Paper text:
Here, we present the first crystal structure of the CRL2VHL complex to 3.9 Å resolution, revealing for the first time the full-length Cul2 interacting with Rbx1, which provides insights to the mechanism of the E3 ligase activity. In parallel, we prepared the same complex in the presence of an HIF-1α 19-mer peptide (residues 559–577) bound to pVHL, mimicking one of the natural substrates of the CRL2VHL ubiquitin ligase. Calculation of the Matthews coefficient retrieved a solvent percentage of 63.9%, consistent with the presence of one protomer per asymmetric unit (ASU) arranged in a C2221 space group. The full-length Cul2 binding Rbx1 at the C-terminal domain and the VHL-box-EloBC at the N-terminal domain constitute our final model. Nevertheless, for the remaining residues (54–156) that constitute the substrate-binding domain and the 19-mer HIF-1α peptide, no electron density was observed. On the other hand, the lack of substantial electron density for the substrate-binding domain of pVHL suggests that this domain is highly flexible and might be present in more than one orientation in the crystal. In Cul2 the globular domain is considerably moved toward the NTD relative to the other Cullins. In summary, these observations highlight a trapped closed state conformation for non-neddylated full-length Cul2 and support the previously reported flexibility of the Cullin scaffold, which is thought to contribute to an allosteric mechanism of polyubiquitination of substrates. The new structure of Rbx1 in complex with Cul2 unveils a novel orientation of its RING domain, resembling an en route conformation between Rbx1-Cul5 and Rbx1-Cul5∼NEDD8. Firstly, the N-terminal loop of Cul2 assumes a critical role in the interaction, with Leu3 inserting into an hydrophobic pocket on EloC, defined by Met105 and Phe109, and Pro5 being involved in a three-way contact with Val181 in pVHL and Met105 in EloC.
Residue numbers in the entry:
A (entry chain A): 1 to 116, 135 to 193, 198 to 290, 292 to 381, 383 to 403, 405 to 500, 506 to 523, 530 to 567, ...
B (entry chain C): 17 to 51, 53, 58 to 112
C (entry chain R): 17 to 102
D (entry chain V): 157 to 193
E (entry chain B): 1 to 9, 12 to 17, 22 to 60, 64 to 74, 77 to 87, 92 to 97
C-alpha cells in the first residue's frame, strides 16, 4: 500500500524477500524490479507492529549466513585437497553478493546505529566467513596452500588467480587489519621459506664457484621478488626478501669476505656483485673496503717506486695521477660507488706520497720543481695546456702531508722565477697562486700574493721615478722593490761606481713616510754585448780594469775576499780566460740545505700562534689537553713535532701563560 | 547516464543517474546486479516524491557556492508524508 | 773590435723596503716588525692584509702598536731602554 | 538533510505533548523527542 | 541564462536559445525539435529569441515550466492527502 505504517504479514515479504536474498548470493540472476521492491519490503517491516522489528531480520539473516557457511564447508570438505578451488569460486561468488546485501540493508542499519556487539551486517557476514576459516581448514588449507608454493624451483605454475584469491581473501575482513593475515599466514610462510633458503643455501654453496654462487643467488632474489609480487600482499615485500638475503647472504659472510681479497685484486663483474650482496648485509662492506685500500696502496706504491735515480718529478706526478684515474674509473664503473671506497682510495694514495726510507720525505720539493719546471720558458711546450697540467697537479698537491715545505720551496721557486725574468706568463703565474689559494686559504698564499704584487707596484713606482727624474734643474736603469717580509731571498754578503744611486734614492724617501730601503747587490746586472751582435755574459763582477793576473792584483779596492775570491769567474769563461791570460776575440743545493731551517722556525711561530689562539678563547687546560688541540688546529699545515710544542709552551710562559703546581696537570692564561 | 524514478501515483521523473545517487537507498538500487536504468516506487505518492526531487536539485546544484542561502518551503499537510518518505529515502 | 773600451750602458738593481730600525724583530715579541705579531697572526680576526699597525715611538724605537700597548698597560717602562716610551 | 529538517519544520507546528500520538512513523516518533535546537 | 525548468507532458529535470533547449529535451526523449512546441500557460515561444530574453524567475528548489507534434503541426497535477 502507501508508505503509511501498515502491519504487514511476516511470511508474505519473507518468501519473495528470502528468495531474492538467495538470488543475490552467488550472483544469480535477480530481476530489475524485485530489487526495486525489496527496500519497500524491508521499510514496511521495520516500522509498524506498531513497533520496530529489524531485530528479527538481523537474527534471521545471521541464521541464513551460518547455514550457507556450513553448506559450503561440507562442499569444501568434500573437495579432496582442492578446497581452495571451490573456495575460490565460493569467495568470488560470495563477496559481491555480500556487498550487495550490505547495500540492501541500509535502512536496517540507519535506525540501528544508535543502538550499538557485532553490528554492520556486512561485517557480520564477513565475520561468518571468519567462522568458515577458523575451522581446521586454517590448519589444513595453509598446509595445502604452501604445498603449491613449496614447488618453487621448477614447480610452476598454478593459477595466480586462484592462489592470489585465496591469500588475498585473508586481508578483507576488519571492523589492526593485518592481524589475521599476519598470525595465520605470514609467520608460517616466513619461517618455512627461511628453512627453505637455509637448506638450499647450503645446497647451493656446496655446488658452485664463488662468482657462480653470487650470480646464482642474485638471480634467485630477482626471481623471488617477482614471485612475492605474484602471490603475496605488498605488506610483506620488505619482510620476506629480508629473510632470503639474510640466509643466502650474511649467513655465510666469512666465505665471501675471504674471497674478497682475491676478487679485489682482479680488475674483473664478480666484484660488482660482491658489492651488491655485501651492501644489504649488517656487516658486509668493511672488509671489502679495507682490501681495496690495501690494493691501491700496493699498486700505487709500486708505480711510485719504479722511478729511482731517474731524476724526474714529472714521472712521479703523472704516475700518481695515473693511479688516481685508474681507480676512479674502477670505483665509478662497477661499484655503483662510492664515498667509502673513494675515501679508501684517498687514504691509500695519502700514504703512498710520503716516503720513509732511512729522505725525507722528498715529495714536497719534487712537487715544487714540477711547478717551477712547468712554468719556465723552455725555448718546448704550449700554453692553454700548462693550466690543464696544473689543474691535474691540484690533486697530487691535495694529498701532500707536509704542505709546509712545499710552500717554503715554492717561495724561492717563484723568487728566482721573477727577479730574473724567468717566468712565461704573469697572467698564468697569478692563476697558479689562485689555485693554491682556493686549495688552502688566505694565510697560505699571502706572501706569495703580495710577493706577486710587488712587480706591479714596482712597475708603477719605476714610472713615478721616471717622472721625478727630470722634474728639477738640470737632470739609466730600472729597479724592483719588494715588501721585505714576503721574500725569503737573503743578501748573501763593493764601493759605489759611476754612481747614480743617490740621485735616485731621494725619491723613495720623499714618496713614503718612513720606509727604510736596503740595497741588495747579489742580484744586479750590467750591460752585455761587447762592440763583436750575435754569448755576452757580463752582469756582475764590476771590475773593468795591463790586460793583469789574479794574484797580481790581490790589492783591490775596499771589498772582502769572502765571495770576491770566488768571482775573480771572469778569467774563466770567455773574455779574460798563473801563466798567461789573453783577451777574447769574439762574443742551489746548499741554498736548500740552509733553507731547511726557516721551515723549522716558521713551524715554531705557527705553533706559537696556535698556543695563544687556543689559550685565549678557552680559559684553562691541562698539559695533555692543550696538545691534541694544537694538533687538531694545525692538521692541514703539517704534522707537528710533539718535541717542539712543549718547548714552545716553555717559551710562551716567559713572555702569556702561567702554571702553578702539578698535582693535576694545569695551565692557566695571563693577559 | 540517465535513470527514471516512478512514484506510486504514476508520475515518472527522469534525471541523470548522479542526481539520483544522492540518497543512499537509490545508489543502493542502481547498485542492484543485472548488468542494473529505470527505477519505480510502489509506496511513495507523487506530491511527496516531487518535493523530494526538488529537494535533490537544490543541494546538488547549490552547495558550498557564493550566495545568500535561502530557506525551504514545505506544505503544512504534506510535511507529515514528506517527513515519512524522507525517513524512507535515508536522505 | 776594441780591447779596453767598456762603455757602461743599461744597469739594474733590486732592493727591499722596511722601517727605520735594525731591527732583530721588535724584541717585545719574537716576530718581524713588518710581519704580523702574535695576537694578530693568531687571533684570525680583522687586520690589514699588508701592514697591521706600525707604531713609531718618540723614543726612536718603533714597535707593533698593540704589543707595546699591552706591555704599556702591564708596566709603563719601555722594554729596550727601561724608560718611558710613546 | 530532508529527514531532519522536515523534523524541524514539523516540530514548529506540533506540541511537545503530541510526539507519540501523531503515529507518523513508528521508527521515527522515537526521534521526535531527541532533537533540540 | 542559468535557469531551471519544469517541462511536463512526465517531468524531467535538466537545464543559449530555445533550439538548444529543445536539444536538451531531445537528450533522452530522442525526438527532433520540429515536433515540439513550447507554451507558457498562455503563449507561444519562438525559436528566434534566446532563453534569457524569453531570468532567475525559478529557484533551484522549486522551478516552473511540452506539446508534441503528432503528424505535422503540434496538437494538444499531483495528489493531496487528507
Ligand atoms: Zn698585530
Ligand atoms: Zn725606546
Ligand atoms: Zn711586536
Amino acid at each position: 500500500m502507501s508508505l503509511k505504517p501498515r502491519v504487514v504479514d511476516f511470511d508474505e515479504t519473507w518468501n519473495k524477500l528470502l528468495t531474492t536474498i538467495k538470488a543475490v548470493v552467488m550472483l544469480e540472476y535477480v530481476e530489475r524490479a524485485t530489487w526495486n521492491d525489496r527496500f519497500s519490503d524491508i521499510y514496511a517491516l521495520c516500522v509498524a507492529y506498531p513497533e520496530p522489528l529489524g531485530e528479527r531480520l538481523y537474527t534471521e539473516t545471521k541464521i541464513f549466513l551460518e547455514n550457507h557457511v556450513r553448506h559450503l564447508h561440507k562442499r569444501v570438505l568434500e573437495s579432496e585437497e582442492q578446497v581452495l578451488v571451490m573456495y575460490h569460486r565460493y569467495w568470488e561468488e560470495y563477496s559481491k553478493g555480500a556487498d550487495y546485501m550490505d547495500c540492501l540493508y541500509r535502512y536496517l542499519n540507519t535506525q540501528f546505529i544508535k543502538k550499538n556487539p557485532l553490528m554492520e551486517i556486512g561485517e557480520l557476514a564477513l565475520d561468518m566467513w571468519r567462522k568458515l576459516m577458523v575451522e581446521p581448514l586454517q590448519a589444513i588449507l595453509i598446509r595445502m596452500l604452501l604445498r603449491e608454493i613449496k614447488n618453487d624451483r621448477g614447480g610452476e605454475d598454478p593459477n595466480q588467480k586462484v592462489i592470489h584469491g585465496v591469500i588475498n581473501s585473508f586481508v578483507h575482513v576488519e571492523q589492526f587489519p593485518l592481524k589475521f593475515y599476519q598470525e595465520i599466514f605470514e609467520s608460517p610462510f616466513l619461517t618455512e621459506t627461511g628453512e627453505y633458503y637455509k637448506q638450499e643455501a647450503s645446497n647451493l654453496l656446496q655446488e658452485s664457484n664463488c662468482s657462480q654462487y653470487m650470480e646464482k643467488v642474485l638471480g634467485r632474489l630477482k626471481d623471488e621478488e617477482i614471485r612475492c609480487r605474484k602471490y603475496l600482499h605488498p605488506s610483506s615485500y620488505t619482510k620476506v626478501i629480508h629473510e632470503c638475503q639474510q640466509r643466502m647472504v650474511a649467513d655465510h659472510l666469512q666465505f665471501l669476505h675471504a674471497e674478497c681479497h682475491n676478487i679485489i685484486r682482479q680488475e674483473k663483474n664478480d666484484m660488482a656483485n660482491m658489492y651488491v650482496l655485501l651492501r644489504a648485509v649488517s656487516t658486509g662492506l668493511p672488509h671489502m673496503i679495507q682490501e681495496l685500500q690495501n690494493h691501491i696502496h700496493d699498486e700505487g706504491l709500486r708505480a711510485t717506486s719504479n722511478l729511482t735515480q731517474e731524476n724526474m718529478p714529472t714521472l712521479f706526478v703523472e704516475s700518481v695521477l695515473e693511479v688516481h684515474g685508474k681507480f676512479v674509473q674502477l670505483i665509478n664503473t662497477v661499484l655503483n660507488g662510492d664515498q667509502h671506497f673513494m675515501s679508501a682510495l684517498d687514504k691509500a694514495l695519502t700514504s703512498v706520497v710520503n716516503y720513509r726510507e732511512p729522505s725525507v720525505c722528498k715529495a714536497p720539493e719534487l712537487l715544487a720543481k714540477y711547478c717551477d719546471n712547468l712554468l719556465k720558458k723552455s725555448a718546448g711546450m704550449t700554453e692553454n695546456e700548462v693550466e690543464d697540467r696544473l689543474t691535474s697537479f691540484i690533486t697530487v698537491f691535495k694529498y701532500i702531508d707536509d704542505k709546509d715545505v712545499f710552500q717554503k720551496f715554492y717561495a724561492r721557486m717563484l723568487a728566482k722565477r721573477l727577479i730574473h725574468g724567468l717566468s712565461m706568463s704573469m697572467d698564468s703565474e697569478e692563476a697558479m697562486i689562485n689555485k693554491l689559494k682556493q686549495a688552502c686559504g688566505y694565510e697560505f698564499t699571502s706572501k706569495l700574493h703580495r710577493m706577486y704584487t710587488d712587480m706591479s707596484v714596482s712597475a708603477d713606482l719605476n714610472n713615478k721615478f721616471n717622472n721625478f727624474i727630470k722634474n728639477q734643474d738640470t737632470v739609466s736603469f730600472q729597479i724592483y722593490v719588494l715588501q721585505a717580509g714576503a721574500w725569503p731571498l737573503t743578501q748573501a754578503p763593493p764601493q759605489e761606481l759611476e754612481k747614480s744611486v743617490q740621485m735616485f734614492e731621494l725619491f723613495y724617501s720623499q714618496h713614503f713616510s718612513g720606509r727604510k730601503l736596503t740595497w741588495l747587490h747579489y742580484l744586479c746586472t750590467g750591460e752585455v754585448k761587447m762592440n763583436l751582435k750575435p754569448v755576452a755574459m757580463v752582469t756582475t763582477y764590476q771590475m773593468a780594469v795591463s790586460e793583469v793576473s789574479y794574484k797580481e792584483l790581490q790589492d783591490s779596492t775596499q771589498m772582502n775576499e769572502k765571495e770576491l775570491t770566488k768571482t775573480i769567474s771572469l778569467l774563466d769563461v770567455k773574455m779574460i780566460n798563473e801563466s798567461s791570460f789573453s783577451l777574447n776575440m769574439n762574443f742551489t743545493p746548499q741554498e736548500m740545505e740552509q733553507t731547511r731551517s726557516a721551515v723549522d722556525e716558521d713551524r715554531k711561530m705557527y705553533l706559537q700562534a696556535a698556543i695563544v689562539r687556543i689559550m685565549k678563547a678557552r680559559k684553562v687546560l691541562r698539559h695533555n689537553a692543550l696538545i691534541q688541540e694544537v694538533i687538531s688546529q694545525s692538521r692541514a699545515r703539517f704534522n707537528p713535532s710533539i718535541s717542539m710544542i712543549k718547548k714552545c709552551i716553555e717559551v710562551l710562559i716567559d713572555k702569556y701563560i702561567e702554571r702553578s703546581q702539578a698535582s693535576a696537570d694545569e695551565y692557566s692564561y695571563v693577559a | 547516464m540517465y535513470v527514471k524514478l516512478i512514484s506510486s501515483d504514476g508520475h515518472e521523473f527522469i534525471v541523470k543517474r548522479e542526481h539520483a545517487l544522492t540518497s543512499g537507498t537509490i545508489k543502493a538500487m542502481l547498485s542492484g546486479p543485472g548488468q542494473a536504468n529505470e527505477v519505480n516506487f510502489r509506496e511513495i505518492p507523487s506530491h511527496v516524491l516531487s518535493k523530494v526531487c526538488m529537494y535533490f536539485t537544490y543541494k546538488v546544484r547549490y552547495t558550498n557556492s557564493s550566495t545568500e542561502i535561502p530557506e525551504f518551503p514545505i506544505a503544512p499537510e504534506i510535511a507529515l508524508e514528506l517527513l515519512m518518505a524522507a525517513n524512507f529515502l535515508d536522505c | 773590435a776594441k780591447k779596453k773600451r767598456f762603455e757602461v750602458k743599461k744597469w739594474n738593481a733590486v732592493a727591499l723596503w722596511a722601517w727605520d730600525i735594525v731591527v732583530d724583530n721588535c724584541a717585545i715579541c719574537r716576530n718581524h716588525i713588518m710581519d704580523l705579531c702574535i695576537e694578530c697572526q693568531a687571533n684570525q680576526a680583522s687586520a690589514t692584509s699588508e701592514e697591521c699597525t706600525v707604531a713609531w715611538g718618540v723614543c726612536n724605537h718603533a714597535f707593533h702598536f698593540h704589543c707595546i700597548s699591552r706591555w704599556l698597560k702591564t708596566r709603563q717602562v719601555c722594554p729596550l731602554d727601561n724608560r718611558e716610551w710613546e | 538533510t530532508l529527514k531532519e529538517r522536515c523534523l524541524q519544520v514539523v516540530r514548529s507546528l506540533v506540541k511537545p505533548e503530541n510526539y507519540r500520538r501523531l503515529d507518523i512513523v513508528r521508527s521515527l516518533y522515537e526521534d521526535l523527542e531527541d532533537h533540540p535546537n | 541564462m542559468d535557469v531551471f525548468l519544469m517541462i511536463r507532458r512526465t517531468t524531467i529535470f535538466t537545464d543559449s536559445t530555445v533550439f538548444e533547449l529543445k536539444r536538451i529535451v531531445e537528450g533522452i526523449l530522442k525526438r527532433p525539435p520540429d515536433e515540439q512546441r513550447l507554451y507558457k500557460d498562455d503563449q507561444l515561444l519562438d525559436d528566434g529569441k534566446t532563453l534569457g530574453e524569453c531570468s532567475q524567475t525559478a529557484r533551484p528548489q522549486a522551478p516552473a515550466t511540452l506539446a508534441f507534434r503528432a503528424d505535422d503541426t503540434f496538437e494538444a497535477p499531483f495528489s493531496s492527502p487528507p
